[PDB]
Scaffold this motif. Structure first.
Motif, PDB file in Angstrom:
ATOM      1  N   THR A 178     103.144 128.960  90.469  1.00 35.06           N
ATOM      2  CA  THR A 178     101.879 128.312  90.171  1.00 35.06           C
ATOM      3  C   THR A 178     102.096 127.305  89.029  1.00 35.06           C
ATOM      4  O   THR A 178     102.813 127.580  88.070  1.00 35.06           O
ATOM      5  N   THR A 206     105.141 133.565  90.471  1.00 29.09           N
ATOM      6  CA  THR A 206     104.089 134.530  90.810  1.00 29.09           C
ATOM      7  C   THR A 206     104.565 135.422  91.954  1.00 29.09           C
ATOM      8  O   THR A 206     103.777 135.955  92.729  1.00 29.09           O
ATOM      9  N   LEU A 234      99.640 136.254  84.500  1.00 29.98           N
ATOM     10  CA  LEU A 234      98.992 135.014  84.885  1.00 29.98           C
ATOM     11  C   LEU A 234      97.689 134.812  84.110  1.00 29.98           C
ATOM     12  O   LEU A 234      97.491 133.767  83.519  1.00 29.98           O
TER      13      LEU A 234
END
Ligand SMILES: *[C@@H]1O[C@H](CO)[C@@H](O[C@@H]2O[C@H](CO)[C@@H](O[C@@H]3O[C@H](CO)[C@@H](O)[C@H](O)[C@@H]3O)[C@H](O)[C@H]2NC(C)=O)[C@H](O)[C@H]1NC(C)=O
Ligand SMILES: *[C@@H]1O[C@H](CO)[C@@H](O[C@@H]2O[C@H](CO)[C@@H](O)[C@H](O)[C@H]2NC(C)=O)[C@H](O)[C@H]1NC(C)=O
Ligand code: NAG
Ligand code: NAG
Lengths: 172, 321
Positions: B32, B310, A52
């Motif tokens: 996300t 995620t 991420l």
């Protein structure tokens, strides 16, 4: 996924497990219970946070560029300006599409992998005192009170203690 | 009397769909958004210096149209041109308008330095009812309309060396009268000529007499040209008529400056990325708001949504109903 645990030999997940991603359920003489495994959970989360943070890391700052909207027909130079911007946008759109596909395939596989890692770690811990039922559960072949279960979960289960007791229940 | 120990993973009631290599839609526990698809509607006034053009184009502010005089010596990181902008001085065109607008926008400043040009034998400071300044006639503040003195317009030959260590931008023009009566009345000679040169380059423009469409009291036009003079170089202006002379030069810079077309209002907030639709956040790597951007921006993409998983695959309990 590639390891065949999540959505594979493990029929489904546990909505009841709210304090962790992976964990244990048991039945013994004292009743039932549930506990998260903090380490497998954290290994998955650290890897996901890792990817991420790589994806959302700022990399371009642009100032004066070409014009991209036009109020007049001009011909050749404007055709080239539009073509350049459209080429760019398609290449970046493709990159974006590919990135998420690869990332998501990998995320599904690494979480499947961590499920499998925990399953194999648990199986090796138990040695010859349990058997693989095939559905994500071990049948333990001795009296395993709540102290014994927590010994399995926090990595202190001495298999030699229960081995003779267990070996006898298996080969009769 | 043994014991069962079951390994497992969590699930959620409400998972999210994502795309993978093998599946266009598969459910995971969370995801996300990687595409910024919305804006405030407002251009944030920090941290970039935003200069609202209001009723002015950058070029009218450059030339010094009277309603643009508030922009004298202004600077910007981003000049914002509005669709309501209008001209209100002498009608003009700029051959290669786009390039002049671009190089001024990029320079980021309208700093003007007046220079003592000596125009021997002509009348200076000509004006017109096309370009009102207060109650009476006027002209572009940065340009000097030269016309005959008495009944002569001599050959103008002047020089301005650049002894500075920066590039000078000179803006100048050529007047195209609507009739021969206007030409000879203003400049004596039946056909003017303007030659503007440096050591390495030159531009010569022959004026062209004839009617254009009437704009603000006149069928005549001015054509705007520019010349950059480098350190060590020299400007020479030569003309027997029709010169709209520079009064000085613009200081050129390089930097982060630009220009944008937008009607978004400017507001008190902080945002690194500006689009014509307004500012957008830049925490996400991609955006779908506008391909036109300024600052630290996500890259423009065609997708309105892209979901990064995620979490693990979401497999709920088999339903009995
Ligand atoms: C129009 O004005 C320009 C600018 O002053 C005149 O240019 C100058 O012309 C003179 C000769 O006509 C040049 O003089 C020469 O200079 C060199 C050294 O630089 C010297 O060795 C020679 O003996 C000679 O005198 C001068 O350099 C030149 N200056 C520039 C900046 O170009 C031009 O002659 C004028 N013409 C008319 C018709 O008025
Ligand atoms: C931002 O502004 C752009 C352009 O002003 C918008 O794009 C237009 O959207 C309509 C559909 O609503 C399309 O038919 C047009 O083709 C688009 N115009 C151009 C010039 O591209 C865009 O929708 C706005 N987006 C946001 C999030 O405000
Ligand atoms: C799941 O993701 C969203 C962002 O998409 C985030 O705001 C939310 O807090 C996350 N929830 C969990 C349980 O991780
Ligand atoms: C513009 O700047 C110069 C010097 O930098 C100055 O002499 C001139 O008067 C300024 N004009 C205005 C309107 O501020």
């Amino acid at each position: 996924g590639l390891f065949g645990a999540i959505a594979g030999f493990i029929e489904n997940g546990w909505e009841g497990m709210i304090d962790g991603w992976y964990g244990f359920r048991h039945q013994n003489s004292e009743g039932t219970g549930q506990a998260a495994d903090l380490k497998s959970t954290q290994a998955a989360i650290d890897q996901i946070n890792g990817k991420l943070n790589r994806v959302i890391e700022k990399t371009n700052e642009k100032f004066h560029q070409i014009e991209k909207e036009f109020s007049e027909v001009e011909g050749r130079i404007q055709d080239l300006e539009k073509y350049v911007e459209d080429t760019k946008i398609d290449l970046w759109s493709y990159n974006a599409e590919l990135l998420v596909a690869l990332e998501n395939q990998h995320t599904i596989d690494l979480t499947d992998s961590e499920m499998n890692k925990l399953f194999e770690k648990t199986g090796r811990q138990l040695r010859e005192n349990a058997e693989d039922m095939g559905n994500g559960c071990f049948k333990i072949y001795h009296k395993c009170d709540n102290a014994c279960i927590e010994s399995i979960r926090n990595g202190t289960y001495d298999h030699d203690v229960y081995r003779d007791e267990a070996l006898n229940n298996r080969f009769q | 009397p043994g014991a069962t120990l079951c390994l497992g993973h969590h699930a959620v009631p409400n998972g999210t769909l994502v795309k993978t290599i093998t599946d266009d839609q598969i459910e995971v526990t969370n995801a996300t958004e990687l595409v910024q698809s919305s804006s405030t509607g407002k251009i944030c006034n920090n941290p970039h210096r935003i200069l609202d053009g209001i009723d002015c184009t950058l070029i009218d502010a450059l030339l010094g149209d009277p309603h643009c005089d508030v922009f004298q010596n202004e600077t910007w990181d981003l000049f914002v041109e509005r669709s309501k902008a209008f001209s209100n001085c002498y009608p003009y065109d700029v051959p290669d308008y786009a390039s002049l607008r671009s190089l001024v926008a990029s320079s980021g400043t309208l700093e003007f330095i007046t220079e003592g040009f000596t125009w021997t034998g002509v009348t200076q400071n000509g004006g017109s009812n096309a370009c009102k300044r207060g109650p009476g006639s006027g002209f572009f503040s940065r340009l000097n309309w030269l016309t005959k003195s008495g009944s002569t317009y001599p050959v103008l030959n002047v020089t301005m060396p650049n002894n500075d260590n920066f590039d000078k931008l000179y803006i100048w023009g050529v007047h195209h009268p609507s009739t021969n009566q206007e030409q000879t009345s203003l400049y004596v000679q039946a056909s003017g000529r303007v030659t503007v040169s440096t050591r390495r380059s030159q531009q010569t423009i022959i004026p062209n007499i004839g009617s254009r469409p009437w704009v603000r009291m006149t069928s005549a036009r001015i054509s705007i040209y520019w010349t950059i003079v480098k350190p060590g170089d020299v400007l020479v202006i030569n003309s027997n008529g029709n010169l709209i002379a520079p009064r000085g030069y613009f200081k050129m810079r390089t930097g982060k400056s630009s220009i944008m077309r937008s009607d978004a209002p400017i507001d008190t907030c902080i945002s690194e990325c500006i689009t014509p639709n307004g500012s957008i956040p830049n925490d996400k790597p991609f955006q779908n708001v506008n391909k036109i951007t300024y600052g630290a921006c996500p890259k423009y993409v065609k997708q309105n949504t892209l979901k990064l998983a995620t979490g693990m695959r979401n497999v709920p309990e088999k339903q009995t109903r």
